[PDB]
Amino acid sequence: MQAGQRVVDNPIYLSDMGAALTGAESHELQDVLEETNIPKRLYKALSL
């Protein structure tokens, strides 16, 4: 699953999969799942 293969048919899953690597406590995960807008979840996932 590379970014150059264009096989990321579901970007939401790729952002979620990238946020899954974070070691943040479960609460942070629940809060990020609560987020609905896209730049907030990408911004927060990067922050984590």
Partner: protein
């Protein structure tokens, strides 16, 4: 004098070595049929969106 190749999400910039890895095995048939020819060659084209 060959039919067009299946680029399949692979940019080959001019004067830039690149690797192509299609998962299908039908393009290999075309690669093995050209071995008896004196000069073996292939062309590279680009895809639209």
């Amino acid at each position: 004098h060959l039919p067009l190749i299946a680029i399949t999400r692979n940019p080959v910039f001019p004067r830039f070595i690149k690797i192509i890895e299609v998962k299908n095995k039908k393009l290999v048939e075309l690669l093995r049929r050209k071995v008896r020819l004196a000069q073996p060659y292939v062309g590279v084209f680009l895809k639209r969106d």
